[PDB]
Amino acid sequence: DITVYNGQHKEAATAVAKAFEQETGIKVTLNSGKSEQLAGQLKEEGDKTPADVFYTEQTATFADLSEAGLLAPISEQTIQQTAQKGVPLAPKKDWIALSGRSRVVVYDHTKLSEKDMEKSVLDYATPKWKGKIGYVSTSGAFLEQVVALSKMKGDKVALNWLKGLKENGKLYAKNSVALQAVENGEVPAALINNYYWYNLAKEKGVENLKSRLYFVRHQDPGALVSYSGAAVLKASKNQAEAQKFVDFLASKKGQEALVAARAEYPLRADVVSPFNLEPYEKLEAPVVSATTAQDKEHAIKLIEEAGL
Ligand SMILES: [Fe+3]
Ligand SMILES: [Fe+3]
Ligand SMILES: [Fe+3]
């Protein structure tokens, strides 16, 4: 039996653990919390940690644990199961990316079509979109989008986009609220993440929704994907079962369990999502370094400077 420190949505972690317990008869205990807190906890606990595996919604969390000497190596055959082009790889082969969440533009297809969409996420912050684009500045993925713009295009561009959103956009408290505002006609488009929309479609039926998604693709900064993953702790004295679990998460079965539970993109090429997601490779995500705590502080500074 193993202990998994879990920064992922509880429904995802519960599903894969259950599927694993059913496939192997090995029991999984979840300890759930915020990935950054769990990573600090793993650092402080050190050799004495009870965690066998760290399962996170954000692979960026692994860099600091790897450099601290806290992660075990995983099988290269396992790493290769999800190593599609563009998927982040651990240089020390001591964690693996398993699934992804995408930035997207949601639009009311009763008012707009693809003719009205933009080639670049930058172009939504422009006067064409005054009072017509919703955004969620408090959102973690909004903050990852800002980090990506800084990285890909520089701070001037990033700041200018934020000022453009201040001037032209409608601020919503959360992604679900933005999505509802588009469905309800308050605003004709909004910047959100994919799974909100696919959750609502699965639940209500797409034919009954007024909104649709637009993917910018071509490695635009607005095609940003955030990656979930897993690592074995070097401190574990149950390496065999920890390793068996991380192998399971990369298996067809483990990926199928995840995608049934949550509308994340599987990183195995032979798994479909019942949420009707496109294949990961079609997203054309840009390649962006992992977010650091310094990157996040910097992005928060730009958001403040833009009056947001
Ligand atoms: Fe959430
Ligand atoms: Fe949310
Ligand atoms: Fe969210």
Side-chain angles (χ1 to χ4, degrees):
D1 294 352
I2 49 159
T3 294
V4 172
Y5 280 19
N6 172 46
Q8 306 204 34
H9 189 281
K10 325 236 185 78
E11 169 166 9
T14 301
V16 295
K18 174 201 185 198
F20 185 66
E21 289 169 345
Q22 309 206 163
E23 168 74 7
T24 66
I26 299 162
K27 282 261 319 142
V28 168
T29 298
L30 297 171
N31 173 225
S32 299
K34 274 176 195 169
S35 289
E36 278 157 328
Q37 275 32 85
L38 291 168
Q41 186 176 346
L42 289 164
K43 280 183 268 264
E44 188 282 326
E45 287 174 345
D47 283 351
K48 272 72 174 314
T49 192
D52 297 296
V53 168
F54 182 28
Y55 182 74
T56 181
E57 88 285 18
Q58 177 50 260
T59 52
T61 319
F62 293 137
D64 267 15
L65 298 172
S66 179
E67 287 310 326
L70 305 168
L71 308 181
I74 292 161
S75 165
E76 210 269 351
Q77 312 309 312
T78 298
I79 291 164
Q80 284 300 327
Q81 302 305 299
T82 58
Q84 294 207 47
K85 293 140 178 208
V87 166
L89 291 168
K92 295 169 58 192
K93 300 190 181 261
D94 55 0
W95 53 261
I96 183 171
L98 295 163
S99 58
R101 297 168 311 282
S102 179
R103 295 303 287 176
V104 71
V105 180
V106 59
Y107 68 96
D108 174 346
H109 81 156
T110 77
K111 297 187 187 302
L112 296 186
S113 74
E114 296 169 329
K115 284 175 190 182
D116 301 293
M117 296 295 99
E118 306 295 347
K119 196 217 279 169
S120 185
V121 77
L122 291 181
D123 283 7
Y124 292 100
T126 55
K128 166 185 164 182
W129 289 95
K130 189 164 60 87
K132 286 181 169 177
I133 185 72
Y135 66 104
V136 179
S137 64
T138 62
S139 156
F142 177 98
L143 198 183
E144 300 285 296
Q145 174 73 90
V146 171
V147 173
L149 278 173
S150 292
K151 289 176 180 180
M152 291 177 74
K153 308 301 190 180
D155 279 9
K156 280 190 201 140
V157 166
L159 188 55
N160 187 59
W161 187 70
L162 288 168
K163 282 181 155 75
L165 285 182
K166 178 61 170 163
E167 169 173 333
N168 296 297
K170 290 194 163 176
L171 178 58
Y172 292 101
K174 333 167 55 192
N175 290 315
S176 65
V177 176
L179 169 59
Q180 290 300 322
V182 174
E183 278 291 332
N184 292 337
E186 308 189 3
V187 70
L191 312 179
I192 65 172
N193 305 317
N194 72 292
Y195 48 92
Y196 295 99
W197 185 88
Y198 287 101
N199 284 166
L200 181 70
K202 194 75 167 109
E203 164 200 13
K204 295 209 148 12
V206 66
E207 296 300 272
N208 306 127
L209 290 187
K210 281 184 306 255
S211 57
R212 292 293 190 277
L213 300 181
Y214 176 74
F215 294 83
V216 67
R217 313 182 201 276
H218 57 92
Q219 302 182 337
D220 186 71
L224 183 72
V225 169
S226 293
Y227 297 93
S228 295
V232 176
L233 280 303
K234 196 178 280 160
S236 171
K237 304 139 164 213
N238 194 357
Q239 299 281 321
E241 295 190 334
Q243 299 280 346
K244 167 90 74 164
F245 183 66
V246 172
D247 293 351
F248 176 74
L249 294 170
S251 77
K252 195 169 175 194
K253 196 141 300 203
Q255 291 267 296
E256 287 174 344
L258 175 66
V259 298
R262 194 160 162 80
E264 299 212 4
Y265 295 87
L267 297 184
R268 280 190 84 88
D270 63 356
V271 175
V272 290
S273 175
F275 289 88
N276 202 30
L277 297 192
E278 302 137 329
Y280 166 81
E281 73 207 286
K282 300 255 195 138
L283 297 172
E284 294 163 3
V287 173
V288 187
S289 64
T291 300
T292 64
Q294 184 199 171
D295 291 328
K296 275 184 197 196
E297 288 156 347
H298 174 62
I300 286 155
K301 291 191 291 283
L302 290 173
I303 286 163
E304 281 186 40
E305 181 175 12
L308 297 169

mmCIF file of all heavy atoms in Angstrom, residues 9 101 175 193 195-196 199 262, ligand 1:
data_model
loop_
_atom_site.group_PDB
_atom_site.id
_atom_site.type_symbol
_atom_site.label_atom_id
_atom_site.label_comp_id
_atom_site.label_asym_id
_atom_site.label_seq_id
_atom_site.Cartn_x
_atom_site.Cartn_y
_atom_site.Cartn_z
ATOM 1 N N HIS A 9 -6.783 17.823 -8.727
ATOM 2 C CA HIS A 9 -8.205 17.837 -8.386
ATOM 3 C C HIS A 9 -8.497 16.495 -7.748
ATOM 4 O O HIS A 9 -8.002 15.442 -8.236
ATOM 5 C CB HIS A 9 -9.050 18.017 -9.659
ATOM 6 C CG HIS A 9 -10.520 18.268 -9.420
ATOM 7 N ND1 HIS A 9 -11.427 17.267 -9.112
ATOM 8 C CD2 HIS A 9 -11.253 19.406 -9.538
ATOM 9 C CE1 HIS A 9 -12.640 17.785 -9.001
ATOM 10 N NE2 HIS A 9 -12.565 19.080 -9.269
ATOM 11 N N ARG A 101 -3.885 20.766 -19.441
ATOM 12 C CA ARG A 101 -5.082 21.647 -19.450
ATOM 13 C C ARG A 101 -4.704 22.812 -20.365
ATOM 14 O O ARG A 101 -3.528 23.223 -20.446
ATOM 15 C CB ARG A 101 -5.456 22.169 -18.067
ATOM 16 C CG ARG A 101 -5.853 21.057 -17.085
ATOM 17 C CD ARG A 101 -5.946 21.565 -15.579
ATOM 18 N NE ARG A 101 -4.786 22.342 -15.143
ATOM 19 C CZ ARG A 101 -3.607 21.801 -14.782
ATOM 20 N NH1 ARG A 101 -3.461 20.466 -14.785
ATOM 21 N NH2 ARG A 101 -2.615 22.599 -14.423
ATOM 22 N N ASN A 175 -13.403 31.467 -13.541
ATOM 23 C CA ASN A 175 -13.670 30.935 -14.857
ATOM 24 C C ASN A 175 -15.100 30.514 -15.061
ATOM 25 O O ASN A 175 -15.634 30.785 -16.126
ATOM 26 C CB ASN A 175 -12.738 29.796 -15.168
ATOM 27 C CG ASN A 175 -11.350 30.268 -15.363
ATOM 28 O OD1 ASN A 175 -11.110 31.270 -16.057
ATOM 29 N ND2 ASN A 175 -10.397 29.610 -14.678
ATOM 30 N N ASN A 193 -10.070 28.279 -19.255
ATOM 31 C CA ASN A 193 -9.407 27.029 -19.608
ATOM 32 C C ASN A 193 -10.391 26.015 -20.185
ATOM 33 O O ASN A 193 -11.628 26.126 -20.004
ATOM 34 C CB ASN A 193 -8.849 26.385 -18.353
ATOM 35 C CG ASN A 193 -7.940 27.322 -17.583
ATOM 36 O OD1 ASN A 193 -7.103 28.036 -18.191
ATOM 37 N ND2 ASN A 193 -8.040 27.307 -16.236
ATOM 38 N N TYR A 195 -11.373 22.940 -19.629
ATOM 39 C CA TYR A 195 -12.191 21.885 -19.002
ATOM 40 C C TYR A 195 -13.500 22.439 -18.492
ATOM 41 O O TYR A 195 -14.455 21.662 -18.381
ATOM 42 C CB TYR A 195 -11.447 21.132 -17.879
ATOM 43 C CG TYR A 195 -10.781 22.097 -16.932
ATOM 44 C CD1 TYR A 195 -11.440 22.548 -15.774
ATOM 45 C CD2 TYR A 195 -9.463 22.574 -17.222
ATOM 46 C CE1 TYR A 195 -10.820 23.462 -14.921
ATOM 47 C CE2 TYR A 195 -8.862 23.538 -16.378
ATOM 48 C CZ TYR A 195 -9.554 23.953 -15.259
ATOM 49 O OH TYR A 195 -8.937 24.870 -14.453
ATOM 50 N N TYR A 196 -13.554 23.707 -18.151
ATOM 51 C CA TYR A 196 -14.855 24.317 -17.780
ATOM 52 C C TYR A 196 -15.887 24.066 -18.882
ATOM 53 O O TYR A 196 -17.055 23.723 -18.604
ATOM 54 C CB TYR A 196 -14.719 25.831 -17.538
ATOM 55 C CG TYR A 196 -13.868 26.073 -16.390
ATOM 56 C CD1 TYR A 196 -12.533 26.391 -16.580
ATOM 57 C CD2 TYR A 196 -14.366 25.978 -15.081
ATOM 58 C CE1 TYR A 196 -11.699 26.582 -15.506
ATOM 59 C CE2 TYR A 196 -13.543 26.182 -14.007
ATOM 60 C CZ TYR A 196 -12.200 26.501 -14.235
ATOM 61 O OH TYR A 196 -11.322 26.745 -13.189
ATOM 62 N N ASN A 199 -16.702 20.303 -19.370
ATOM 63 C CA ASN A 199 -17.588 19.892 -18.231
ATOM 64 C C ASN A 199 -19.044 20.302 -18.465
ATOM 65 O O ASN A 199 -19.945 19.465 -18.296
ATOM 66 C CB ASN A 199 -17.135 20.546 -16.944
ATOM 67 C CG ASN A 199 -15.900 19.886 -16.367
ATOM 68 O OD1 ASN A 199 -15.253 20.451 -15.480
ATOM 69 N ND2 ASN A 199 -15.551 18.733 -16.874
ATOM 70 N N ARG A 262 -11.856 13.610 -15.532
ATOM 71 C CA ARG A 262 -11.521 15.043 -15.657
ATOM 72 C C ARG A 262 -11.185 15.313 -17.093
ATOM 73 O O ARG A 262 -10.516 14.515 -17.760
ATOM 74 C CB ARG A 262 -10.295 15.440 -14.813
ATOM 75 C CG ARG A 262 -10.139 16.942 -14.643
ATOM 76 C CD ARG A 262 -9.244 17.313 -13.450
ATOM 77 N NE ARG A 262 -8.751 18.697 -13.545
ATOM 78 C CZ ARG A 262 -9.493 19.755 -13.202
ATOM 79 N NH1 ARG A 262 -10.745 19.580 -12.756
ATOM 80 N NH2 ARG A 262 -8.990 20.990 -13.303
HETATM 81 FE FE FE B 1 -10.420 23.739 -10.298
#
